[PDB]
Design a protein around this ligand. Structure first.
Ligand SMILES: C[C@@H]1O[C@@H](O[C@@H]2[C@@H](O[C@H]3O[C@H](CO)[C@H](O)[C@H](O)[C@H]3O)[C@@H](O)[C@@H](CO)O[C@@H]2O)[C@@H](O)[C@H](O)[C@@H]1O
Ligand SMILES: C[C@@H]1O[C@@H](O[C@@H]2[C@@H](O[C@H]3O[C@H](CO)[C@H](O)[C@H](O)[C@H]3O)[C@@H](O)[C@@H](CO)O[C@@H]2O)[C@@H](O)[C@H](O)[C@@H]1O
Ligand SMILES: C[C@@H]1O[C@@H](O[C@@H]2[C@@H](O[C@H]3O[C@H](CO)[C@H](O)[C@H](O)[C@H]3O)[C@@H](O)[C@@H](CO)O[C@@H]2O)[C@@H](O)[C@H](O)[C@@H]1O
Ligand SMILES: C[C@@H]1O[C@@H](O[C@@H]2[C@@H](O[C@H]3O[C@H](CO)[C@H](O)[C@H](O)[C@H]3O)[C@@H](O)[C@@H](CO)O[C@@H]2O)[C@@H](O)[C@H](O)[C@@H]1O
Ligand SMILES: C[C@@H]1O[C@@H](O[C@@H]2[C@@H](O[C@H]3O[C@H](CO)[C@H](O)[C@H](O)[C@H]3O)[C@@H](O)[C@@H](CO)O[C@H]2O)[C@@H](O)[C@H](O)[C@@H]1O
Ligand SMILES: C[C@@H]1O[C@@H](O[C@@H]2[C@@H](O[C@H]3O[C@H](CO)[C@H](O)[C@H](O)[C@H]3O)[C@@H](O)[C@@H](CO)O[C@H]2O)[C@@H](O)[C@H](O)[C@@H]1O
Ligand SMILES: [Ca+2]
Ligand SMILES: [Ca+2]
Ligand SMILES: [Ca+2]
Ligand SMILES: [Ca+2]
Ligand SMILES: [Cl-]
Ligand SMILES: [Cl-]
Ligand SMILES: [Cl-]
Ligand SMILES: [Cl-]
Ligand SMILES: [Cl-]
Ligand SMILES: [Cl-]
Ligand code: NA
Ligand code: NA
Lengths: 292, 292
């Protein structure tokens, strides 16, 4: 089963993503194929998949930027029926907004079927151009047709996943305790994590004994990433990944406060020094506490 | 011995505080007697007392706002010698800026003696008017003269003191762990804590599932109080008191993230709800973790 999470949804035949045109919140805004840049935030192309209770393999798909839902227009089973963004709710009973998502016959990509119409999300004619129509279309679960096949590229971690990446790190103190604050997290590219740091004003902050020292830098970075999240995205039900750690050096006589993020493959953490913007696989400290 | 800390220094004969005139950082800015308002930040009237290593009962006194030091002008032992703010450093060997501070013969107020001149800080003629001259003057350790007697009203807590106030609270979970970030903390009046909340923009923030929920409010408040500290005060070597707590309800099935401060008498904590500005002796949660 596809897991709850945020996905960048990429056609299997051509490198077009599912894009809500201009990120618009208007009802009936077209969902189209569009090119994308890897290792960036693709602002109009992220989708929060919310599993429906007791309805196997069935989800709402909420655009992260607009807060509006993937909607098959009037639920029509006619081939060519528009797929658009439309107002809704995460656990709606409106079948126009409910999608059964299961692996295709290649075992890697998925097909996306409207729960009411039983038709599939289709990149019409396999057209790779920016703005190409996506429609509901007749199809089967098992056929090869790449027009109806979609890679769900996972852009978030659950809290259990973040905890696993931390636990595999070698720079964790024996007395470590971690404090989990949310359930599902958008993982940022370093380019974006850095941009938030820059825009927070921290690059200009001066270290001052106790009154603006390492703990203040680290907490300010976390707060800046939390503000960024709320100010940037209209969907609810996820957070943005940015941790704080306290750590102690090998000699046991100096402690430090810093941030952390996740690798691109989501399997490991990487430390961030908010006093200078650097990313480090070894910051010189073993973490005794984290919150994220 | 007077403990390291921040003090509001009040004459024993008349209710005038030691005030660095207009908070000015200029060398030679007069230190004068001035009236004050209890339970406020008295912006020009706070002094960070730094003990000198191996020099019994002897300190520098740094104005918290200006960052400049109490200085006996050219170290003169003449009665009437100006006491002024002047550039220096926390552990200076300049005797013009070193002060031996010990209890007077009333056992409550202190006398303040210049380490070089052996003269005492004196509110000239006991004058209660705003802007009255403070000077160095001849005197004795044991005499009653109220012109040379000063109540050191303690406005900060050590970390050990904050930890004690938390440990006496009844709403602490069995699994509680606290994480100490600094060593000495300015305790804010609630009026000021509230003003920082208002000025942070939090009163206008909307609760949103995971993306701006209780943890985000609490961390933003802490960050706002940390920014306030650095932007408001020029002295170093202290922090501003504002904690974050995570807690769990009695039934064990709901958790919450909130802030905390200290009572006026510094002996107890009081919870703060950053979603609405309220102060509570019981927020409905027992804390399992804190950082401050
Ligand atoms: C059959 C029809 O279903 C619902 O209307 C849908 C639309 O539903 C969504 O938007 C409407 C406002 O237009 C409303 O906010 C609703 O809660 C939301 O789910 C939408 O799916 C469009 C495009 O496919 O189709 C129908 O208009 C319902 O509101 C109608 O009363 C009626 O039951
Ligand atoms: C080039 C082409 O690929 C396949 O046709 C697709 C369409 O395939 C879907 O619709 C057809 C009926 O129109 C049939 O139901 C098929 O099972 C289903 O997957 C559809 O993807 C459209 C729009 O993008 O493009 C092509 O027509 C294939 O069936 C055709 O034989 C042909 O090889
Ligand atoms: C005896 C004299 O002592 C020092 O000068 C002091 C002043 O010292 C303070 O300010 C000066 C700059 O004016 C400098 O920054 C110094 O480090 C600092 O401690 C001050 O106490 C004034 C007013 O009482 O008196 C003397 O000017 C030293 O700089 C001089 O060279 C000389 O040794
Ligand atoms: C009213 C007055 O109070 C006391 O005199 C103080 C001064 O006291 C200090 O200085 C005198 C010498 O001028 C002497 O050394 C005394 O021990 C020392 O405390 C001084 O505080 C000035 C400036 O504020 O005001 C008064 O003159 C007292 O000795 C006088 O007899 C008289 O009762
Ligand atoms: C917010 C906006 O994002 C970018 O433009 C989007 C655009 O983004 C995708 O396509 C561009 C090329 O047009 C790049 O491949 C990006 O990496 C993609 O994410 C599309 O989403 C369209 C259609 O909805 O809207 C544009 O606003 C960027 O080019 C803009 O500068 C801007 O940052
Ligand atoms: C920053 C400034 O603070 C206040 O004025 C100070 C003044 O403050 C004291 O005296 C006033 C009465 O003049 C009240 O009692 C305050 O509670 C005191 O803290 C003095 O410090 C003088 C001399 O250094 O400077 C003034 O700037 C306040 O009145 C101003 O509005 C302002 O907030
Ligand atoms: Ca949360
Ligand atoms: Ca600090
Ligand atoms: Ca610290
Ligand atoms: Ca959150
Ligand atoms: Cl094409
Ligand atoms: Cl096939
Ligand atoms: Cl949701
Ligand atoms: Cl008077
Ligand atoms: Cl006497
Ligand atoms: Cl200091
Ligand atoms: Na820096
Ligand atoms: Na509110």
């Amino acid at each position: 089963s596809l897991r709850r999470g945020i996905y960048h949804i990429e056609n299997a035949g051509v490198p077009s993503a599912i894009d809500l045109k201009d990120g618009s919140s208007s009802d009936g805004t077209p969902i189209v194929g569009w090119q994308f840049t890897p290792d960036t935030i693709n602002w109009h192309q992220l989708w929060l998949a919310e599993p429906i209770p007791n309805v196997a393999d069935t989800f709402t798909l909420c655009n992260l930027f607009s807060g509006t839902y993937m909607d098959l227009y009037n639920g029509s089973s006619e081939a060519g029926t528009a797929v658009n963004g439309w107002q809704g709710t995460a656990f709606t009973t409106n079948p126009h907004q409910l999608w059964t998502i299961k692996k295709s016959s290649d075992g890697t990509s998925y097909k996306i079927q409207n729960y009411g119409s039983k038709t599939f999300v289709d990149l019409v004619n396999g057209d790779s151009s920016d703005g190409a129509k996506i429609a509901g279309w007749t199809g089967t679960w098992d056929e090869g047709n790449p027009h109806q096949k979609w890679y769900f590229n996972r852009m978030s971690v659950s809290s259990a996943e973040a905890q696993a990446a931390i636990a595999r790190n070698p720079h964790i103190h024996g007395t470590y305790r971690g404090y989990i604050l949310d359930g599902e997290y958008l993982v940022l590219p370093n380019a974006t994590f850095t941009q938030i740091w820059k825009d927070s004003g921290l690059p200009g902050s001066k270290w001052r004994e106790q009154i603006y020292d390492c703990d203040d830098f680290a907490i300010a970075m976390k707060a800046a990433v939390g503000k960024w999240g709320a100010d940037s995205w209209k969907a609810n039900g996820f957070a943005i990944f940015c941790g704080v750690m306290l750590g102690v050096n090998k000699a046991g006589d100096a402690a430090h406060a810093y941030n952390f993020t996740l690798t691109k493959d989501h399997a490991d953490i990487v430390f961030f020094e908010p006093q200078n913007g650097g990313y480090l696989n070894d910051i010189g400290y073993d973490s005794y506490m984290a919150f994220y």
